[PDB]
Amino acid sequence: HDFYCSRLLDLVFLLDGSSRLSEAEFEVLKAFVVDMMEQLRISQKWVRVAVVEYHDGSHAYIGLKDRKRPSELRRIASQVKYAGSQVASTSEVLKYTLFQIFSKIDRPEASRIALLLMASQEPQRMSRNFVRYVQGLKKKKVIVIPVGIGPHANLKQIRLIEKQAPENKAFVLSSVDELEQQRDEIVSYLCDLAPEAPP
Amino acid sequence: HPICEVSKVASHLEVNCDKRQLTALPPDLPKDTTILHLSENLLYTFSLATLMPYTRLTQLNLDRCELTKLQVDGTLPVLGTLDLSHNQLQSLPLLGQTLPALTVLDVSFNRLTSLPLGALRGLGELQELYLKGNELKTLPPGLLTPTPKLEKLSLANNQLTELPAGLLNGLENLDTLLLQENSLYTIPKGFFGSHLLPFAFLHGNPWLCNCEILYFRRWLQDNAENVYVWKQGVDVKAVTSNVASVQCDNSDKFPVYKYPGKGCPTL
């Protein structure tokens, strides 16, 4: 509820759906999202959004073009079923986002951000093309804000990100319990990234 | 304006005439109108020519309108996006001449039984073509030739039994091929060629595991990472990596990539 802005934004949520987060802890991540959403004019007109929980392949719950009232979204976002799988390919969800989310460029004047909630580390066999994706994304003016969480956050990937571009600022949290803490600060940095929006 | 909504979204002038029972295009709409939504109405038919007055028209939606016929006259200088999904069109109209700037074409979920030769002639700028959910059984030869900039193709959910061997020729920017849920059994020799294709869905097919599925076998082997499964769950959609989904018709859900090819020719 603190500070809260509204802008031309295409915000993508990528939630780690690995076991490195208890079901109980998944909820605290989901909460984090629902808040992030509230602090933003939800509509395919100002701020579009998408929620994807990953591990083996992506699980799209919301899409930028999905037309549903804000109330409706926030709900769905919160009803995202816990996965708890053992693996969560970060390389995969980014390969996915690069080609299945930001393939074409509809709203060219808006900013794009791929909030990447990492809580684990993907099996190295899957990172072969990681960088490609981050590059191909940046090439599409997509900004990636990795948000490490807990002792198993893949820092090298959060670091490789930070340095692919300036806006790729990272954020680390000892746990899910620390999101409600950083929430505001984060959604801030976002505000300062995208162009103002008229009511 | 009286019937539809208006609203300057950034530098786009969006107009909504969606879900309000309309039977045909309203009158005097904004002269800057870049985007037009006509979804969920009742038209059964339409005629792109009546849109010429809208010289700024960058995007059009005629989905869920019962369209069974689409007149294609005059010309729409800048239309890049055309949604005709969820309609009852018996036959794919020839957009080429009239929609020179089209980059996205969606006729998924219609009644299409076939695509006339040169069906795509004139649509060079085309990048996304979706024909999922139809009744196509086979394809025209140079179907995709008119479009070498294509990035995604969806032919999933149709009754296709075989693809044109050189269907992907010229496409060096294709990044997604969707063919799951069809009647295919084999893959033409060198059908994939040598591009990368990060996303290909081939599950849901009676793959005939005989000596002629071998090109397709190796191919899969070198592309395990590129084969995904599509699952919809009325609230979630999932693209999951699994080369194993491409299974042998009768062979007890036997992974086609593991098919021994025992007794098959040497070369």
UniProtKB/Swiss-Prot annotation, chain A:
Occurrences of domain VWFA (ranges): 10-186
Disulfide bond positions: C5-C191
Top-rank lineage group of the source organism: Eukaryota
Name of the protein described by the UniProt record: von Willebrand factor
Lineage of source species: Eukaryota, Metazoa, Chordata, Craniata, Vertebrata
Gene that specifies this protein: VWF
Stretch of the intact protein here: 1268 to 1466 of 2813
UniProtKB/Swiss-Prot annotation, chain B:
SS bond partners: C4-C17, C209-C248, C211-C264
LRRCT domain boundaries: 205-266
First and last residues shown, out of full length: 17 to 283 of 652
LRR repeats: 32-52, 56-77, 78-99, 101-121, 125-146, 149-170, 173-194
Underlying gene: GP1BA
Positions glycosylated per UniProt: Q21, Q159
Protein name: Glycocalicin
LRRNT domain: residues covered: 1-31
Organism: Homo sapiens
Effect seen on changing G233 to S/V: Increased binding to vWF
